[PDB]
Amino acid sequence: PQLPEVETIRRTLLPLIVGKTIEDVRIFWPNIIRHPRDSEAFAARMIGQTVRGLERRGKFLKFLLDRDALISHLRMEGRYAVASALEPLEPHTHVVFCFTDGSELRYRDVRKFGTMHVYAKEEADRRPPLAELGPEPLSPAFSPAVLAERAVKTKRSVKALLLDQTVVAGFGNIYVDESLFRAGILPGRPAASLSSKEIERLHEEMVATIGEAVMKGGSTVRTYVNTQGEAGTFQHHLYVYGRQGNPCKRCGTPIEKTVVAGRGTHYCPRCQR
DNA sequence: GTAGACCTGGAC
DNA sequence: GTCCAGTCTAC
Ligand SMILES: [Zn+2]
């Protein structure tokens, strides 16, 4: 999940948990718990706290409780669902928060890549993993200037730059490839090779793409769905991600796939320069 | 920067 | 069987 997907989860999950009080926290895969590292302390401290809010920072969910904030990263396949504690758990459920009303928040993650950190609210933003995050792309904090500042300072590919959460927070493999196509820039190009014009265009398309994806409920290309199990619809508006071999929607040239920054990379060799 | 790590299951 | 799908870490 990237910003659009996490934001959709945030919006759909909040009403299902706000105001509920945690009675127990059960952990079936301890490695997901990163702080405190002792899963027993992680579970103990949340008992008795009430969910007061749910925010998003980059690709992270921030559950606001009473004294603490639970920072959750879904990584590649993490997902949340709210259900009855009387029903059997679904496969690959690794963390469960039991509420006093008999309902529970279940975290499933087939690949076990997700992470959870709990800190006092006032400490969450100045500690990892949130501390080093770049600006929110849909905020004034993210501007062409902010992008250029990091671009004209590194030689790595522009794709690697956009995937760097310290540069700007929220973009993943899908939206980086899509934004670059829309801006007409090849993913393997050195970030420092982009002109002021290209930087402005890239910023514009990044904001437009991420904004459009949020409105469409994110992209469901594998298994991502909102809290209600409803798939997003942005996958129908993809120009290059996962379309290798298919004709470009703008010029008809076959989309190509290669490896850039160690990630599958999709692009149109004609529309992108 | 770039293979290797961490894991698990779905296409080829 | 072999290939493929986000962040921390090592030759
Ligand atoms: Zn094209």
CB A3 within 8 A of CB A169: yes
**Do A205 and A268 touch, CB atoms closer than 8 A?**
no
End-to-end alpha-carbon separation of chain A, Å? 28
Binding site residues of A for DNA, as ranges?
Answer: 92, 111
| Strand C close to A113 by CB, under 7 A | yes
Is A36 a catalytic site residue?
Answer: no
> Using CA atoms, how far apart are residues A233 and A137, in angstroms rounded to an integer?
21
The active-site residue, picked from A10, A59, A79, A106, is A59
How long is the CA A86 to C1' C8 vector, in angstroms? 37
**Closest-CA residue to A172 (of A109, A116, A224, A105):** A224
What is the maximum span of chain A, computed from C-alpha positions, in angstroms?
A: 59
Using the Cα atoms of residue A145, residue A152, residue A238 and residue A229 in order, give the sign of their dihedral: negative
State the Cα–Cα distance between residues A227 and A6, nearest whole angstrom.
10
- Report the C-alpha gap between A43 and A24 in whole angstroms: 7
Q: What is the DSSP secondary structure assignment for residue A80, as one 8-state letter?
A: E
> Protein A262 CA to nucleic acid B2 C1', in Å?
7
Nearest Cα to Cα of residue A271 among A152, A151, A181, A156: A181
DSSP A10: H
Q: Is A137 a catalytic residue?
A: no
For this PDB entry, the determination method is X-ray
**Multiple choice CATH, A1-132, 3.30.920.30, 3.30.460.10, 1.10.10.10, 3.20.190.10:** 3.20.190.10
- Pairing mode of beta strands A103-108, A79-84: antiparallel
A249 touches A268 (CB < 8 A):
no
State both tokens at A206.
């990044």
CATH class held by domain A133-273: mainly alpha
CB A226 within 8 A of CB A9: yes
Q: What does chain A come to in residues?
A: 273
Q: Give residue for tokens 């969450």.
A: A124
Place of tokens 């409105």: A215
Q: Where in chain A is the domain with CATH 1.10.8.50?
A: 133-273
Nearest to A76 by CA among A5, A158, A18: A5
Read off the amino acid at residue A82. V
Q: How many angstroms is the resolution?
A: 1.6
